[PDB]
Structure 1
Amino acid sequence: TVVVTTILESPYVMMKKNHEMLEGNERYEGYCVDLAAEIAKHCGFKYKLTIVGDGKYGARDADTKIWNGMVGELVYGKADIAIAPLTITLVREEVIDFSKPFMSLGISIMIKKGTPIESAEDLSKQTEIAYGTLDSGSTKEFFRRSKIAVFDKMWTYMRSAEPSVFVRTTAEGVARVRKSKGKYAYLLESTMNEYIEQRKPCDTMKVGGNLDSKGYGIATPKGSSLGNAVNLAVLKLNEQGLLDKLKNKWWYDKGEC
């Protein structure tokens, strides 16, 4: 009975509208939920979906150097596999094993629908409409490290803009976009942006192309006997369309706009 650690992040895994009535594994739903079923189907095992203990994805702690979130749960033997939007980064591929990407993304732009800007280039030149990123994360560092013209030029601005274009939480940013009446563009991972654009208050939208390329993968403990099977499962699901099928499912069918 494989112990699956995952996490609450819409539309990857969510609590059923009447979850308090359903029990066990049926209490949940979302892209990753469906995906877990396919993995397990194609792999031939029984599983128990468990929401990650401390609610984090996974990072080494500032002092302890010890892994937290799902990564940690995987490194220290608490769970057997992680099925969630876990971006495949070096730091993690050094301690746990990733399947091939099951979905992809990149830093994109979120503008309040109807906004003049349409690309990063369109922003870089601009000075009228402000814009920023989360205060700390993939996105924030990508720019303070990016040696590309269009991006270096952008870092400088956000770098010391006042008020600060940065935001403490990920929803807080989206909030500024809307309430800023158009004087604010947010840069966030393409997946979140897409979701939000299909949500109520349909007043935002993703614009331009992704400024980079990443991808989410399924994680298993180093030495796991599920490793090889899982990776092959992700490949087959992609080869039969099931993934796109799903991404389209939770972002559009379930979309509200």
Structure 2
Amino acid sequence: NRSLIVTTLLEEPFVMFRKSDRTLYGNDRFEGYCIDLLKELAHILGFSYEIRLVEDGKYGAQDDKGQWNGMVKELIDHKADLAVAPLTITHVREKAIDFSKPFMTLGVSILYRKGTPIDSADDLAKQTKIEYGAVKDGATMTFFKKSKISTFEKMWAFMSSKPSALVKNNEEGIQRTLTADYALLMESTTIEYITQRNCNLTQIGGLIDSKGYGIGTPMGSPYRDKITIAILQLQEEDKLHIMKEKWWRGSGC
């Protein structure tokens, strides 16, 4: 019964440190949507596991020499059996790792202060006053870096140049939108979570694309297909809807 190593990262409301009056340790430290999903997978498949936060705190992207970092790298180097996180399924990633079928669908959109004229990526790309960016070495950054749409190449040209447009993680980005004249390009279900809690913030425009989160495994993993089946089972039983309603609030706004 060897324990599977699960790689992940802190990201509200998917993976969080649970509140306690003493120092917690091991798996007991964590709670959130992806923790509940992991618990379901472990139950259905019958495995035990050890959660390990990815050291560099990244989701994963390729450098110019094609080397990966983040959770994707942990899977490639067979340091982890599974990545259980809001890990975006993308063509470039499917070349290096395997994914389950998606457990949640989302798309790229914009987080910004309420009360302004702007209503689309178009408006940001036109102007230089309002700064904008995305999480460094995640799928949204890669989306822009790869885009052939004029508006998005324009936006990448910006993000790529401005030293601090690319933020370390979502939290740093959300604080930037509250602290400065800055809009964050961010995945839509996280926006949904934030705007039900911070009434100062809103989504700008709609979804720029449509994609999904999946459980990541190393290529050739003998678990990936069973995990797909389990996700399809949870879906059929309405369990992912229940899990989302559990973690998305709360009250406000």
Q: What TM-score range do you get, normalising by the shorter chain?
A: 0.7 to 0.9
Counterparts of residues 1-257 of structure 1 (less than 5 Å):
1-18=3-20, 20-63=22-65, 65-120=66-121, 123=123, 130=130, 132-134=132-134, 138-140=139-141, 142-143=143-144, 146-148=147-149, 152-153=150-151, 156=154, 159=157, 167-169=165-167, 170=169, 171=171, 173-180=173-180, 185-200=183-198, 202-253=199-250, 257=253
Structure 2 counterpart SS, 1:252: coil
Output the aligned Cα RMSD: 3.3
1:247 maps to a residue whose letter is K
Report deviation, 1:29. 0.3
Report deviation, 1:176. 4.7
Report deviation, 1:203. 0.6
Distance 1:131 1:191, change over 3 A: farther
Report deviation, 1:220. 1.6
Inter-partner Cα distance in structure 2 for 1:207 and 1:131: 14
Structure 2 counterpart SS, 1:220: strand
Inter-partner Cα distance in structure 2 for 1:143 and 1:115: 24
Distance 1:209 1:83, change over 3 A: same
Report deviation, 1:49. 1.9
> Which 5+ residue runs of structure 2 have no aligned equivalent?
none
Which of these two proteins has the greater Rg computed from alpha carbons?
Answer: 1
Identity of aligned residues (%): 47
Inter-partner Cα distance in structure 1 for 2:48 and 2:63: 32
Distance 1:143 1:97, change over 3 A: closer
Report deviation, 1:131. 5.2
Report deviation, 1:80. 1.4
Larger deviation: 152-161 or 96-105?
A: 152-161
Question: TM-score normalized by structure 2?
Answer: 0.80
Cα-to-partner distance string for 1:84-129 (whole Å, 9 max, x where unaligned): 11111223212221001111211212231233334446x3797697
Inter-partner Cα distance in structure 2 for 1:92 and 1:249: 30
Distance 1:134 1:73, change over 3 A: closer
Contact 2:7–2:84 at 8 Å: present in 1 too?
yes
> Which 5+ residue runs of structure 1 have no aligned equivalent?
none
Inter-partner Cα distance in structure 1 for 2:77 and 2:173: 34
Larger deviation: 47-56 or 86-95?
A: 47-56
Inter-partner Cα distance in structure 2 for 1:234 and 1:135: 27
Cα-to-partner distance string for 1:30-64 (whole Å, 9 max, x where unaligned): 1110000111111122222222233332334555x
Inter-partner Cα distance in structure 1 for 2:248 and 2:127: 33
Question: TM-score normalized by structure 1?
Answer: 0.78
